[PDB]
Every structure is written in C-alpha cells, then in structure tokens.
Write a protein that binds this ligand. Structure first.
Ligand SMILES: [Mg+2]
Ligand SMILES: [Mg+2]
Ligand SMILES: [Mg+2]
Ligand SMILES: [Mg+2]
Ligand SMILES: [Mg+2]
Ligand SMILES: [Mg+2]
Ligand SMILES: [Mg+2]
Ligand SMILES: [Mg+2]
Ligand SMILES: [Mg+2]
Ligand SMILES: [Mg+2]
Ligand SMILES: [Mg+2]
Ligand SMILES: [Mg+2]
Ligand SMILES: [Mg+2]
Ligand SMILES: [Mg+2]
Ligand SMILES: [Mg+2]
Ligand SMILES: [Mg+2]
Ligand SMILES: [Mg+2]
Ligand SMILES: [Mg+2]
Ligand SMILES: [Mg+2]
Ligand SMILES: [Mg+2]
Ligand SMILES: [Mg+2]
Ligand SMILES: [Mg+2]
Lengths: 70, 68
RNA sequence: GGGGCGAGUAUUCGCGCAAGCGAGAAAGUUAAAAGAAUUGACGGAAGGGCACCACCAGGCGUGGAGCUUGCGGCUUAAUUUGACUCAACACGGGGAAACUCACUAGUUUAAGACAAGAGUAGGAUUGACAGAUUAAUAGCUCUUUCUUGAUUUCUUGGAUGGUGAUGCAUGGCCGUUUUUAGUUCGUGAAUAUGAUUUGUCUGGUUAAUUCCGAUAACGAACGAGAUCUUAACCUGCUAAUUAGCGGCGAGUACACGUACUUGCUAGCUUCUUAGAGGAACAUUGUGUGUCUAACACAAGGAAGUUUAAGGCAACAACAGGUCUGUGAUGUCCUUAGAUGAACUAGGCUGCACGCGUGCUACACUGAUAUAUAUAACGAGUAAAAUAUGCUUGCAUACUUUUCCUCCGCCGAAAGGCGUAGGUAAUCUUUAUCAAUAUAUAUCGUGAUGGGGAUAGAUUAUUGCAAUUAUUAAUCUUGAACGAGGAAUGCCUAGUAAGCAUGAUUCAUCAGAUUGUGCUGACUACGUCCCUGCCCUUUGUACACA
C-alpha cells in the first residue's frame, strides 16, 4: 500500500575476477626438464581436468571431488 | 445499447422452441470494445423427432375435407 | 394591454379624523414566466379484483440459555477482499494447519521475445567442495581457485505478465419487476391540427385479455394453453441375464405334510427389470346459471381440485451483481530493490459489545440397559510406494500396491496384521446398508440417574509438518437452563412436525447445502380487515417521477 522504506543499500551480485592467460601458469617448460605439470590431475575425469591447489586440499571444479592435504 | 431486428414468426417457450430454432453467439473485437452477435433462425417447419421422424408443429389441428 | 422580477415600491400632488384611496417611475437583474390538451407515476379520494413470501381457523416455532457458523465494531505488524430492505448477512459453491493467497516480516529468481550498438575466443558468460555467513544443504554473499564455452552478459527501443484500479467504459452469464397476465400489428373509424385513442369492454365465467356476449370495429401474432421429464393403473403384448419362480434328485429333523441344507436343470412371467401401446372426456344421474360460457354433489372407476410434482418462460426495464471463473476485453498503472513467478515463518480463528441462519435442551407421552421387527435415492482402481551390488544416496519390475472392501487373527475401545472378490443388476451390499417404533426391567417429581458447556490426564490414526489444542478412543470435572418480554417466520395431505440416511466439498475434518426414504396430526374449503400487486373513475404546480 505504501512505498517501501529503504534504509540498507542493495545486496551486490557476484562478479568473477578475471585472470589473463591463466593457463600459461599451469604448464611451464625449460630447455632441460621438459613440460612439468604445476597443478595436479583428477581421478575420474577425462585427462586434463585439473584441480585447484587450495590452502589445505585439492578441489575438482567439474565433479567436486575433494582430497584433503595432510 | 442493444438493437433488435426481427422478421416473421418465432417461438420462445416449451419443447418446440428447442427443436425448431437454431441459435449461435459470437463476438467481435473492435478498436473501442467488444460487440456481441446473436442470431436465431426458425426452420421452415422442418424438424425430425426424438423418435426420429419429420414432425411439424405442436400447434395445429387441420381438419380434412370430405371426399366428393 | 404589449416577456418575467424590481413594484402598485420610491418621490410628488389631490382627497380623508385615521386607516388609507386615486394618479405613478428609474437604476439593477433575468431565458423564460404563462394557456389548454396527452401518456405515466403518486394520493392519509371513490369503486372492483387476486395471494399462507396477506389475513381468518389452527400446527410448529423463532425472539429468552449453552454452543456452532456468517456480518459490524474494537484490537493488531497483518487480522486480505466483494455484497447491506424484500432482491447483503452456512452467499462468492468461501468446511483457509502448508498450498490455496489476494494481507504482514524477510530472502531468491529470470522462465527480460525481437531489433540496433557495445563486449569477447589471448575467453561473453555458467557451476561449485571447504571455512565464514545465513531459519535454511538459496556459491545468497565473502575468502580461496578450479570448471564451462558463445547458450549468456551491458545500453537504448519494444514486447510480455499481473486475484493491481475502474461492473458508472463493455461482452457473457445470473437475480429482480414476474411465474403475475401481460405486449403488438394490418385496414377502417375518432381528424374537421396534434401528442394519441379504439380494437384490448358494462356484465357473467376461468388458474389465465380463459371463454360467452355487448358492440365503430373486422381480423391476425407472441405470452397463457398445447408441448417435455418423473409418479400413479394394466394377472393384456414383446422379452429372460449379471432376474426370479417352478421341475428332478440326496439329506437333517419333526407331524403322519412342514422348516432348513444341498447337487442339477420340464416349462412360466405373478413378483424384478424395460420397450411399444391403451386409459378420463366432466362419462352417467341430480341441482344452480341468461339454461350460453360454466360450477357443485352422488355412482361407477386405479384415478374426477386440467390426477400430483417439476422444467421452459413474451414486450420493456434496473447505471441490480460479477473485470477475485476465463489465452472475453477498452483505458490507466507496474515491469529487475517487480504490483511477474517462487521459498521460510505469521495472519484470515485475534474479544468489554450489537445483529441474521441454526444445533442441543429444559424431562415420566422420559433417561438407562437388554431383546424383537423393518427403507429409498447413491458410490467405488506421471507420481510415490514393497525387494539383490555398494557406503542417508545410486542403479534396478512401471513385475505388486494407491478406490469399496467380505473373511480370519490381535486389541476395552479407536484401530492394527494377513489374505479374497470387484473397472460392477456379477463383488463390497441391499429377501436388506438406518433411526423414530415395539416388549421387559430399574429410577420416582428431588437442577434429580434431566442437561452436557467448561476443564485435567493418557492412547491412536491422516499428513513433510497437528503448538492457537485436525479428527477419533477411555476415565475424571459437571455451568446456565423450570417453556421464554416487545416483536416476528413457514405452512392446506402422504403435506406440517418428528426420525435417520446417500452424495458435494474431501490427504484428514458437517452442527452446511442438495437429494432420498420411515412414522404421520389439528384447522379452512373462506375473505378483503392488515400487508403487497393489479385495473376503472378522479385531482395534480410531480416527469431524476
Ligand atoms: Mg406453459
Ligand atoms: Mg411588462
Ligand atoms: Mg409551465
Ligand atoms: Mg410477513
Ligand atoms: Mg391466525
Ligand atoms: Mg428447537
Ligand atoms: Mg438464541
Ligand atoms: Mg450467514
Ligand atoms: Mg466476518
Ligand atoms: Mg479447516
Ligand atoms: Mg487476470
Ligand atoms: Mg451493472
Ligand atoms: Mg452485465
Ligand atoms: Mg388502449
Ligand atoms: Mg410383470
Ligand atoms: Mg477476469
Ligand atoms: Mg507463503
Ligand atoms: Mg472468514
Ligand atoms: Mg445431575
Ligand atoms: Mg444425562
Ligand atoms: Mg459451505
Ligand atoms: Mg386489502
């Protein structure tokens, strides 16, 4: 019936922070000691589905398989 | 408003008025509203019966002429 | 004499004791005042008629008490909203725990067509474990950092949805006047202006402008009637299943055929079912009436108030109700912090009080307990649920189950467990699925063994969820009420009243509607006194009447 009362500003939406060419941080190759994986690879996903190197665990963004670091 | 246009002979009550009359309703969307259309036709003394046979009218008592 | 007010007013003169009389303006303001007819509406005017939503003679009540339910008012964060004489108030099929939902407090979502510009494969955008954070297992948001692949995202237009406003912008449908008995047309006549009359009527008669008849009218049409559905009669016709009866055997007991059980299956239609026909015309006798139209009584007959009950419903209207039934709709609002669509909790039910519809009673023509006998209309079968491999989840038969449920067992009871039949004249279940009734005993005029409100405790079932107590079961508690003031409702025969039951809603809940049957009265066979509606004459300065 009345117009609203807005005392608190809006809840903000979720943006996704952007990294340019993040894949070049996943593999690096020297002259000797050829290509070396820097993150690690999954277990039930087709090869090349890498997983996050978190503070204390590894997380697969596609199947959500969690392995605890220890 | 309403406008009526008639011609001839028409019946309203009873069981004959449901047999010998044909009725429809339609509407037309004009720019400024809706109009209703309503048509009613009495058939030329032509109606089969519930025990199907060509009937005539429940209101008539013609008396035949003697043979001479 | 020269539109209406101002006004026979102001000033002046003549006459009069006075009251007053006789001559008599202007400024300003106004679109009509005024005459006579016609149709309607109204009347505390005169006549005539109809009707248990009027009365008379009566029945039963309601209004008074407890409680169930709808409406005002108060209260609240919110107690969502339409309708207010008949013709709003158990109405919106409106019995809301969630949903419904329209209201209150919060939080998500895009399920934002299409066009143009931007942004971008060196990535437009999508999703999410763990910790925090949230009622929340909404990655809602944050930290952290993987996944995804052009589906989306940002800007301006433009659409779409809305139980948002307007029923006084409309369609359709419904209610009411009115279930009354009304409404119109051709030609002729009144005209010798007109609105408009007559036909359509003094009288008798009918449920009825239904008929007879009188007549400046003669004829026609709608409405009434006819028609349609159900009920009542038929030992006559046509039929025999998923209906009956009968016929033939074997028994169990009695009396010298009767009752019941059972296997089988000449013929028949009384009982059951359902198709076609018939039957009432006021027939006959007696009376009243113009001896017309009709009415009353008796006999016969299943039936003689058109035999009973319903459905249909003319011309003309209402600013009657509904946009909260609708992918019926015009206009106005709103459209990403939505008035769209959802998810969580709350409210619609809140209680000094006023009003309508009802349920239960105030006892002995009863209450309690046993026993006997006895109805009619009905209904019924994409999801979740029961069973191997795996760590509360997955893959599995849509092979069982979901509606009415006989029967057996368990339990004081409510109910639980196991198993039939049935998509139905076949089973539930109906040669019977109820309660008023009837019989016998106890109580004994004592707010009493009448009444059963209000409270305490425990137990089951529906459901994801029962707290403000869904419903049901047991024991305990035991209020007002002793026939209802002024007022006022319905009703004429298988009717009133009393008594129970099937369906609608329905996961669960009827003190409500809508049908059905059972027991079955008193009083009238009229009238215009009150109320309402209609017609004639009459008056009118009314016409939104
Ligand atoms: Mg009729
Ligand atoms: Mg003048
Ligand atoms: Mg006048
Ligand atoms: Mg009355
Ligand atoms: Mg009386
Ligand atoms: Mg009573
Ligand atoms: Mg009362
Ligand atoms: Mg009510
Ligand atoms: Mg209310
Ligand atoms: Mg309820
Ligand atoms: Mg709508
Ligand atoms: Mg209206
Ligand atoms: Mg309308
Ligand atoms: Mg006339
Ligand atoms: Mg028979
Ligand atoms: Mg609508
Ligand atoms: Mg809700
Ligand atoms: Mg309510
Ligand atoms: Mg007592
Ligand atoms: Mg008692
Ligand atoms: Mg109801
Ligand atoms: Mg009277």
């Amino acid at each position: 019936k009345k117009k609203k009362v807005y005392k608190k500003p809006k809840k903000e939406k979720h943006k996704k922070k952007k990294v340019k060419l993040a894949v070049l941080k996943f593999y690096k190759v020297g002259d000797d000691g050829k290509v070396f994986r820097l993150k690690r690879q999954c277990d039930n996903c087709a090869p090349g589905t890498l997983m996050a190197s978190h503070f204390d665990r590894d997380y697969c963004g596609r199947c959500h398989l969690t392995i605890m670091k220890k | 408003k309403s406008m009526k246009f008639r011609d001839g002979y028409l019946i309203s009550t009873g069981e004959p008025s449901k047999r010998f009359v044909n009725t429809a309703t339609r509407s037309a969307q004009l720019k400024q509203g809706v109009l209703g259309i309503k048509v009613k036709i009495m058939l030329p003394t032509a109606i089969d019966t519930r025990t199907g046979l060509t009937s005539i009218l429940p209101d008539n008592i013609s008396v035949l002429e003697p043979k001479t």
